[PDB]
Design a protein around this ligand. Structure first.
Ligand SMILES: *[C@@H]1O[C@H](CO)[C@@H](O[C@@H]2O[C@H](CO)[C@@H](O[C@@H]3O[C@H](CO[C@H]4O[C@H](CO)[C@@H](O)[C@H](O)[C@@H]4O)[C@@H](O)[C@H](O[C@H]4O[C@H](CO)[C@@H](O)[C@H](O)[C@@H]4O)[C@@H]3O)[C@H](O)[C@H]2NC(C)=O)[C@H](O)[C@H]1NC(C)=O
Ligand SMILES: N=C(N)c1ccc(C(=O)N[C@@H](Cc2ccc([N+](=O)[O-])cc2)C(=O)N2CCc3nn(CC(=O)O)cc3C2)cc1
Ligand SMILES: *[C@@H]1O[C@H](CO)[C@@H](O[C@@H]2O[C@H](CO)[C@@H](O)[C@H](O)[C@H]2NC(C)=O)[C@H](O)[C@H]1NC(C)=O
Ligand SMILES: *[C@@H]1O[C@H](CO)[C@@H](O)[C@H](O)[C@H]1NC(C)=O
Ligand SMILES: [Ca+2]
Ligand SMILES: [Ca+2]
Ligand SMILES: [Ca+2]
Ligand SMILES: [Ca+2]
Ligand SMILES: [Mn+2]
Ligand SMILES: [Mn+2]
Ligand SMILES: [Mn+2]
Lengths: 214, 454, 216, 466
């Protein structure tokens, strides 16, 4: 099949900027390429077909170019609705193949996360489980690494992470990390910690509690 | 009657280009009338016959004309694991030209097409194609509705049903006043013949260069059949439009099928959905009844009338002998919803092999008496066989049985003077509709100006 | 207008089969090709196959040869995608695609049909309150929704009253059962001064549990 | 008593003969003043007119050439006489009429030419196989009817040009049957194969080397082949004195004039021969198919008897074409041409079963009437043709010519010829309107008003200028 290498995977940009998404093919496809848009939580809209032709209804700020095995999608003066996903697709040969995908995200000033650790609830412990939740809310950029520590030693099995999309108000990101143990295994130890690594601080942000002690 | 045969205007093209094979009047956005001329054997870039189109400005002296440029390069697109190919050599661009609003539609009926998929193919066949141009703006567009991507094997499995590979779309053409291009494809459906209709505005908006195969959703093609009466009938050899059903919102189609029912020939009137309203059967086999059709109201009752040409009709003469002269048939539309009866008038040629009725052109009202008139061509008629054009004046009962004026060819022998005709347009703005006559054998076009009656 | 209307979301078990629909609105399905595309968060977009409804001829990516079977009925003006021998990897969003002008393009898309393959039964969630530990100007609470099936669940604070300053994180599949969490932030003078309750609803099992957050 | 010759009151000998074919003129001097000069010849002799001075022309009809009809058409350097008489002298006075006769015989053992023109499209492949012995088979049956037989062979398909011709892939040009599991010849319009020869084994060995080709559309270009086989006299080899049979075998419809426009071909058929040294029709891809009228002209010009030997699925089609092309015969051909031998013999008997008279160069003032004595001495009025004849039969036609007035030219000649026959009858007409006494007239006669008139035939005439 024809490999479609789309780049970049994501980019942080502002309104009015002029950005360019590229799409490289494993072989020459001679403008037999199309571009697609997928706004957050919605279906697909056709942008370009045959390399340069705009789909009816698409604004003129979108513009496609390229030839051979290298093409591009350019958006002059970004609009608020342009912050979405974008895929390239070749149809020179069967089967059709798509690119990896490019996500346009709002740029803003860096922001350190707000950490908060939560011991297991009294209801959960009575049932036989134990979950230690660690929220990491409102931070920029999105790149972040969480690390759980039991009695000062790392733990990797039983972690359940979840990330939100970029917030519509302040354009930040958030994260929820959940460490689930058994009630018995939870009481074999005392200290429970979640460390956060961000480019905002060379030193990791640390929050922790002690079992029994409060 | 009142055409001037003394002071003519002559336009000319290259030698051997068959300049004048087709012609039409063209009004730009300001109403200034020009003359579009098709030259189907004009040399292309590779010094090979591809055809060409010329847009002649009106000048009482005439002379040479500028070219209306089109893309003559063969196209190849590798898409969907297939290979699409267009071949424009000997395509005959300009074998038919027609003008509507500020748009010219020139067609290449013999443009070939082929689809390659591995070792299989769709067979390199003449699907035909029409080129569209808005001269003042430079916009271009193409329309080739018979191009397919089905491989040859599939047509054999289905016994060659719905086989549009040999359409030759643009063989004949006409545009409705609403702006709907209607192309005659006498090879469609394995030489049964089909009609292709599509709005001009949608051809422009849906076209992009290089696509070759694209959808025109607003288009509408006629239907195949299993009736052996339509086999090799060349349905769409000639086409025209008019009002025949009493409804002024609908436009009716007139189609020629000169070899219908084993070369008996026929002409059929249809609605926009290709449902047949009437059928005029030929009088004699191989006479090519339906070679040309013309629609105009000749008797001044507001109802469009029909004229059919049979250029190879053989007239009965003494001692049980036949003489090929050609014949024209006139059908008057009856009042209200009724079927067109027998011909109201038969016009028969006089010169042997003259091909009287090869072309019939409505002149409008030439002598300004209230009745529209027509012109009939005999491209190899006249006492010298050089060609003649005859004018028949309309009257309350139809048409006069004798011509009011005869135009002798000013060109040498073999010019096919009259093979293409067009009138009902005042080109010099003197209040009288004029007549342009093509002669592709001499690569020229002669303009006859109408003058006040003497 | 050209609109592609697909069937609703499907919830099925592994090894079974499902047949998605793609009905044409504002045009005839017979006009152009009809493609089928599969979408997953990690694997991205994949081309299943195509069909010409005018004749039934089809094309497939060899990766789907067997599971996918594309058909069409011009009577109902619909195109179908059948998936057999379902697996947890078949859980994806499926779109039907048709072109605008170019015969081979991919321009018009349906809204997409969701498919979830799982052996899990309809399980009600277990809601847990998340109170902080035994200081600052801003306090943060939480709520853990664990072990429910199938999706989705609606979560609010104080029955939609407290809406600002909230982060409800996407659900996460935890061994055939989903898990969800939500956080909320206010000032110190608000809590425990004012009651804050976690409202959760799971219409699949028809359960609407609410847990009030209590300090430690 | 008085009649029309006297009561008209004529002025000269010429006007007297113009009154009626019965009037005579007396140029005698010794004639009473009251006695008229323009009367019946009996009345003139009754009034003592000199018999030498009597002008009374009589319309007659005498033969000049009267060769006897031939009993056999065999032998001779074509000294066969099919029409008797061959030339007569006809004399007519104004408004009179005279009658004469003509005999026509379908001579026995007349030489025959047969040119087998054959559809060689793909559906005629089995037709080729069943005619490999046709040359010798035909010679045996025609030997019963003629001693001078010549046969030839030609083949056609269609115009080797798109869309009639497959043009893809390049392999299909050298072998149109590439997509099947067979090989066929490259497409050809019309090709001559064998000139009319009496060596019948040349027919067999040429047919055994022929093979079919393949084109796309059901109608074929056989009419192109009919034209060339007709107007290429020297290449096909039609003898001047022989019945010319052109056997046209096909199983499909035929292209007609103006069909060529679907191949971009618009130049009309010129009716001229275009088969050169390569024996192929060179104008196939540049000149349109002929028309029925042009075919009829060339068929009649070369005395070719066209025979449509077509399959049952197109018999009515070619039976109708045959009605627009007089002299053409139709026979029902099998799907493998297995019955073409008897079909040819039946057509030849049907061809020589009719005798139809034709007039050429008849002056405007003359009008003819004909009678047919076909069968056994049965007179048929107002008819100039016979039917149902057999080889060796003889018919006769009684003819009467009626002249209107007196034309300017006093001597003309026209021809009576049966359709397709070599021989004819030449009628040398002479209009005797003037008198012999006019050749000895006296201009400026002193008997006539002091030299103001001309004295001719015993009367005075106003001279030139009066
Ligand atoms: C070769 O040439 C022959 C001779 O012309 C053609 O045969 C004619 O074909 C046409 C059409 O197929 C016939 O026209 C029809 O005539 C019918 C009446 O015919 C009667 O009288 C004749 C006289 O001999 C009889 O032989 C016959 O059996 C009948 O008793 C009408 O009924 C038809 O009218 C119907 O159809 C027409 C359209 O075709 C409608 O407009 C009418 O309203 C009505 O529905 C029609 O008029 C003609 O009669 C045929 N003649 C003969 C002698 O058979 C061949 O078709 C032609 N072949 C080829 C291959 O070209
Ligand atoms: N209802 C419709 N719209 C409609 C109407 C008519 C047709 C049609 O005419 N079909 C052809 C099919 C076809 C093709 C190739 C070959 N072949 O190559 O053998 C034989 C037969 C057909 O039946 N023919 C008649 C016999 C024939 N013999 N030949 C070979 C030669 O003469 O070279 C070519 C012909 C043409 C299709 C559709
Ligand atoms: C052909 O035969 C007809 C008879 O069938 C002839 O007509 C008659 O000819 C005789 C000749 O003496 C006249 O007396 C009759 O009056 C004619 N019958 C009429 C006029 O009805 C005719 O003359 C013959 N013609 C030839 C050239 O032989
Ligand atoms: C003219 O007719 C008469 C009687 O029919 C016939 O006897 C005579 O022979 C005819 N004339 C000639 C020259 O044969
Ligand atoms: Ca109407
Ligand atoms: Ca009218
Ligand atoms: Ca008039
Ligand atoms: Ca004018
Ligand atoms: Mn054939
Ligand atoms: Mn056969
Ligand atoms: Mn053919």
């Amino acid at each position: 099949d024809i490999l479609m290498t789309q780049s970049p995977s994501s980019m942080s940009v502002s309104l009015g900027d002029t950005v360019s998404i590229t799409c490289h093919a494993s072989q020459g496809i001679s403008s037999n390429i199309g571009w697609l848009q997928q706004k957050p939580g919605k279906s697909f809209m056709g942008l370009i077909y045959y390399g340069t032709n705009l789909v009816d209804g698409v604004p003129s700020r979108f513009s496609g170019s390229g030839s051979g095995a290298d093409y591009s999608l350019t958006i002059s003066s970004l609009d608020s609705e342009d912050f979405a996903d974008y895929y390239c697709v070749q149809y020179a040969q069967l089967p059709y193949t798509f690119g990896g995908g490019t996500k346009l995200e709002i740029k803003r000033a860096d922001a350190a996360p707000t950490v908060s650790i939560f011991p297991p609830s009294s209801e959960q412990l009575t049932s036989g489980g134990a979950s230690v939740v660690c929220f990491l809310n409102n931070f920029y950029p999105k790149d972040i690494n969480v690390k759980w520590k039991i009695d000062g030693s790392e733990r990797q099995n039983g972690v359940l992470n979840s990330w939100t999309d970029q917030d519509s108000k302040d354009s930040t990101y958030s994260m929820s990390s959940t460490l689930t143990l058994t009630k018995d295994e939870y009481e074999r130890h005392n200290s429970y910690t979640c460390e956060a690594t961000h480019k905002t601080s060379t030193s990791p942000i640390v929050k922790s509690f002690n079992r029994n002690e409060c | 009657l009142n055409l001037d045969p003394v002071q003519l205007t002559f336009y000319a093209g290259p030698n051997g280009s068959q300049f004048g094979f087709s012609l039409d009047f063209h009004k730009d956005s300001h109403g200034r009338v020009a003359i579009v001329v098709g030259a189907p054997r004009t040399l292309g870039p590779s010094q090979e016959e591809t055809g060409g189109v010329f847009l002649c400005p009106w000048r009482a002296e005439g002379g040479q004309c500028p070219s209306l440029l089109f893309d003559l390069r063969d196209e190849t697109r590798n898409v969907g694991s297939q290979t699409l190919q267009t071949f424009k050599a000997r395509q005959g661009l300009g074998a038919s030209v027609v003008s509507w609003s500020d748009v010219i539609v020139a067609c290449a009926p013999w443009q070939h097409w082929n689809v390659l998929e591995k070792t299989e193919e769709a067979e390199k066949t003449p699907v035909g194609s029409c080129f569209l141009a808005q001269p003042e703006s430079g916009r271009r567009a193409e329309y080739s509705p018979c191009r397919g991507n089905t491989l040859s094997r599939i047509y054999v499995e289905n016994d060659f049903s719905w086989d549009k590979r040999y359409c030759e779309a643009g063989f004949s053409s006409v545009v409705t006043q609403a702006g709907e291009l209607v192309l005659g494809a006498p090879g469609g459906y394995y030489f049964l013949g089909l009609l292709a209709q599509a709005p001009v505005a949608d051809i422009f908006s849906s076209y992009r260069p290089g696509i070759l195969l694209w959808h025109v959703s607003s288009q509408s093609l006629s239907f195949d059949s299993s009736n052996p009466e339509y086999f090799d009938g060349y349905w769409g050899y000639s086409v025209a439009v008019g009002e025949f059903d009493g409804d002024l919102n609908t436009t009716e189609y007139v189609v020629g099928a000169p070899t219908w029912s084993w070369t008996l020939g026929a002409v059929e009137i249809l609605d926009s959905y290709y449902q047949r309203l009437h059928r005029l059967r030929g009088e004699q086999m191989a006479s090519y009844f339906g070679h040309s059709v013309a629609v105009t109201d000749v008797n001044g009752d507001g109802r469009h009338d029909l004229l059919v040409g049979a250029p190879l009709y053989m007239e009965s003469r003494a001692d049980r002998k036949l003489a090929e002269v050609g014949r024209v048939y006139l059908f008057l539309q009856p009042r209200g919803p009724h079927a067109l009866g027998a011909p109201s008038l038969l016009l028969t040629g006089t010169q042997l092999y003259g091909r009287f009725g090869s072309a019939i052109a409505p002149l409008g009202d030439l002598d300004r008496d209230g009745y529209n008139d027509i012109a009939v061509a005999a491209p190899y008629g006249g006492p010298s066989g050089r060609g003649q054009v005859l004018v028949f004046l309309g009257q309350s009962e139809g048409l006069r049985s004798r011509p009011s004026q005869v135009l002798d060819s000013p060109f040498p022998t073999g010019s096919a003077f009259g093979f293409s005709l067009r009138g009902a347009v005042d080109i010099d703005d003197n209040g009288y509709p004029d007549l342009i006559v093509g002669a592709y054998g001499a690569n020229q076009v002669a303009v006859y100006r109408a003058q006040p009656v003497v | 207008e050209v609109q592609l209307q697909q069937s609703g979301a499907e919830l099925v078990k592994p090894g079974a089969s499902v047949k998605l629909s793609c009905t044409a609105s504002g045009f005839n399905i017979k006009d152009t090709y009809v493609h089928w595309v599969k979408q997953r968060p990690e694997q991205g977009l994949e081309w299943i196959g195509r069909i010409d409804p005018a004749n039934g001829y089809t094309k497939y990516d060899p990766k789907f040869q067997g599971k996918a079977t594309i058909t069409a009925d011009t009577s109902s003006n619909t195109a179908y995608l059948q998936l057999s021998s379902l697996t947890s990897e078949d859980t994806a969003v499926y779109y039907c695609v048709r072109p605008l002008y170019d015969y081979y393009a991919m321009d018009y898309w349906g809204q997409g049909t969701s498919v979830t393959v799982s052996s899990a039964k309809t399980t009600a969630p277990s809601v847990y309150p998340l109170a902080p530990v035994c200081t600052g100007s801003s306090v943060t609470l939480g709520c853990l929704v664990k072990g429910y099936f199938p999706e989705p669940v609606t979560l609010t604070w104080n029955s939609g009253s407290l809406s600002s300053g909230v982060h409800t994180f996407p659900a996460v599949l935890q061994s055939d059962l989903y898990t969800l969490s939500s956080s909320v932030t206010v000032t110190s003078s608000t809590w425990p001064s004012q009651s804050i309750t976690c409202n959760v609803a799971h219409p699949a099992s028809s359960t609407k549990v609410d847990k009030k957050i209590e300090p430690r | 008593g008085p009649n029309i010759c006297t009561t008209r009151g004529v002025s000269s000998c010429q006007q007297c003969l113009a009154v009626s074919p019965m009037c005579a003129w007396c140029s005698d001097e010794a004639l009473p003043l009251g006695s008229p000069r323009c009367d019946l010849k009996e009345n003139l002799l009754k009034d003592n007119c000199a018999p030498e001075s009597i002008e009374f022309p009589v319309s007659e009809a005498r033969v000049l050439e009267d060769r006897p009809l031939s009993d056999k058409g065999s032998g001779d350097s074509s000294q066969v006489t099919q029409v008797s008489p061959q030339r007569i002298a006809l004399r007519l006075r104004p408004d009179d009429s005279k009658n004469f006769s003509i005999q026509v015989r379908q001579v026995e053992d007349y030489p025959v030419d047969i040119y087998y023109l054959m559809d060689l499209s793909y559906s005629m492949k089995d037709d080729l196989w069943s005619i490999q012995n046709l040359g010798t088979k035909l010679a045996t049956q025609m030997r019963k009817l003629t001693s001078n037989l010549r046969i030839g062979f030609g083949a056609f398909v269609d115009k080797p040009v798109s869309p009639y011709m497959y043009i893809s892939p390049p392999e299909a040009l050298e072998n149109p049957c590439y997509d099947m599991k067979t090989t066929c010849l490259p497409m050809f319009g019309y090709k001559h194969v064998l000139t009319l020869t009496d060596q019948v084994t040349r027919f067999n060995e040429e047919v055994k080397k022929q093979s079919v080709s393949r084109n796309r559309d059901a109608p074929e270009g056989g009419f192109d082949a009919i034209m060339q086989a007709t107007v290429c006299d020297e290449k096909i080899g039609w003898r001047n004195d022989a019945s010319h049979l052109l056997v046209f075998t096909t199983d499909a419809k035929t292209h007609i004039a103006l069909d060529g426009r679907l191949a971009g071909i618009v130049q009309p058929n010129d009716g001229q021969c275009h088969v050169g040294s390569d024996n192929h029709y060179s104008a196939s891809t540049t000149m349109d198919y002929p028309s029925l009228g042009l075919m009829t002209e060339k068929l009649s010009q070369k005395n070719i008897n066209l025979i449509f030997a077509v399959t049952e699925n197109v018999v009515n089609l070619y039976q109708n074409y045959s009605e627009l092309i007089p002299g053409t015969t139709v026979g029902v051909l099998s799907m493998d041409s297995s019955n073409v031998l008897q079909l040819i013999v039946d057509a030849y008997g049907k061809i020589r079963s009719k005798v139809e008279l034709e007039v050429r160069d008849l002056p405007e003032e003359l009008s003819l009437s004909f009678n047919a004595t076909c069968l056994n001495n049965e007179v048929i009025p107002g008819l100039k043709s016979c039917m149902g004849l057999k080889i060796g039969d003889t018919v006769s036609f009684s003819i009467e010519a009626k002249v209107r007035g007196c034309p300017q030219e006093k001597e003309k000649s026209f021809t009576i010829k049966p359709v397709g026959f070599k021989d004819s009858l030449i009628v040398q007409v002479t209009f005797d309107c003037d008198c012999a006494c006019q050749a000895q007239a006296e201009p400026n006669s002193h008997r006539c008003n002091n030299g103001n008139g001309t004295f001719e035939c015993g009367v005075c005439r106003c001279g030139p200028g009066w």
